Design a protein around this ligand. Structure first.
Ligand code: NAP
Ligand code: GXC
Length: 166
């Protein structure tokens, strides 16, 4: 759907109902259904992540396979084997389609350029706590479809939102 001369930027994240996406350097739930969803959307694309999200990736999927991994860091000497490290968002968003995959800092940086958000809401009542990474706030310029609740294999409930804007 994307003309090759354009620059589509999308954000994709999974959040608790409270907006928590990250805590203690990790994602504070386990949801294989969301991993599969994230993989289906991002496979084959350039993905952009902050350095702390690179650190948070399980070693088995660091780099995330089948995607061009781009890591934003101000550390010139940062070691991200199998990825590329860029010092600015400008060098990160050169592809016709980019998926920004976290974390809290980088979603805030990228949201003003984005025209798609793919959001998984996890029906888990984790209260926001000091130091948590949080999902970005979407204003009224965004619109989209809210999916139905589904139970994961474990009985954890989740639903998918597909948002877009002009
Ligand atoms: N639930 C989800 O969908 C999801 C997805 C992804 C991540 N997470 C979780 O979110 C947390 C990580 O989020 P976070 O907000 O703490 O960190 P982050 O956004 O992943 O990374 C922050 C790092 O990115 C670099 N950075 C930020 N802005 C930059 C800029 N303008 N230019 C160059 N570099 C920049 C800096 O790296 P340097 O310090 O190296 O300079 C900064 O420390 C983890 O808990 C992770 O597991 C959740
Ligand atoms: C899955 C978490 C997540 N969900 C959404 N909706 N958006 C995100 N940005 C997001 O974070 C992505 C970075 C953390 O990714 C993971 C963390 C723990 C386990 C597995 C993966 C992915 C591995 S995968 O499914 O992409 N690839 C293979 C080969 O498993």
């Amino acid at each position: 759907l994307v003309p090759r001369g354009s620059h589509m930027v999308g954000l994709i994240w999974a959040q608790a109902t409270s907006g928590v996406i990250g805590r203690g350097g990790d994602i504070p739930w386990r949801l294989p259904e969301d991993q599969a969803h994230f993989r289906e959307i991002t496979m084959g694309h350039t993905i952009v992540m902050g350095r702390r999200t690179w650190d948070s990736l399980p070693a088995k999927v660091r780099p995330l396979p089948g995607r061009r991994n781009v890591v934003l860091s101000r550390q010139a000497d940062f070691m991200a084997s199998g990825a590329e490290v860029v010092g600015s968002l400008e060098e990160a968003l050169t592809s016709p389609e980019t998926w920004v995959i976290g974390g809290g800092q980088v979603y805030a940086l990228a949201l003003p350029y984005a025209t798609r958000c793919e959001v998984t809401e996890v029906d888990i009542g984790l209260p926001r706590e000091a130091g948590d990474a949080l999902a970005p706030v979407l204003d009224e310029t965004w619109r989209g479809e809210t999916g139905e609740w589904r139970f994961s294999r474990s009985g954890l409930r989740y639903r998918l939102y597909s948002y877009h804007r002009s």
